[PDB]
Structure formats: C-alpha cells, structure tokens
C-alpha cells in the first residue's frame, strides 16, 4: 500500500509547519513547561488550523 502513506504524510507536513510556526522546532518541540504552556502562539494560527480542519 505505497501511496496513502504519502498522501497523509503531505498532510503531516502541514502539521509540522504548524509546529514550526508555534515554537520553531520541526518535531521535538519542548514548549510545554511544567506550569503551563510557554511562549504562546503568534497571531494568525487558529485560522490556519481551521483551514486544515
């Protein structure tokens, strides 16, 4: 089943772009301090998440 792997990984490439815009890291974004989330989202992210949804 070669191809749906790559379809859904293109969607996951959008999701790693979202992680990048949130923190900066591709995958291993720490970003969650004990004591709540640190350094909140830049203005212009929730509409992108709406589009992805």
């Amino acid at each position: 089943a070669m191809t749906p792997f790559f379809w859904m990984f293109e969607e996951r490439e959008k999701m790693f772009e979202f992680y990048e815009r949130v923190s900066g890291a591709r995958m291993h974004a720490a970003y969650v301090r004990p004591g709540g989330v640190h350094q909140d989202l830049p203005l212009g992210l929730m509409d992108d998440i709406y589009e992805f949804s």
């Binding site: 909140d40 989202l41 203005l43 212009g44 992210l45 929730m46 509409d47 709406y50 949804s53």
Partner: protein, 68 residues
C-alpha cells in the same frame, strides 16, 4: 488592548460522515450488458468464420484444379 487568537465570531462546521456512493449500476443489468456483448461477439464471429470457410473451400478448389 489584547491581540490573542480567538475564533472570529465562531467557526463553521466540518462534517464527519462516510461518503460512499455505492455505485452501483444494479449489477443484474451488468450481467445483461456482459451477456449482450458476449452474444454480439459470438454472432459476428460466427458470420466471419463461415465466410472464411467459403473462401477456404475456394483454396481447396485451387489445389484440386492446379494439381495434374
């Protein structure tokens, strides 16, 4: 002033229904299509084989007349 990211007056819906059209063609009709094309091929093949039998009889006449 505050410049967070809330939804702008709320957001629209996103469906979660399994879209499968089950098309279809009412497969007994597909049997009718297949048997119809099958019988069409049989009738045309039948006609062409019998005319080639006629012309092969002409080739038999060629070898009969040419021989002595």
């Amino acid at each position: 002033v505050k410049q967070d990211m809330p939804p702008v007056g709320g957001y629209g819906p996103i469906d979660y229904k399994r879209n499968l059209p089950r098309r279809g063609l009412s497969g007994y009709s597909m049997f009718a299509v297949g048997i119809g094309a099958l019988l069409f091929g049989y009738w045309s093949m039948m006609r062409w084989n019998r005319e080639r039998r006629r012309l092969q009889i002409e080739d038999f006449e060629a070898r009969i007349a040419l021989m002595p």
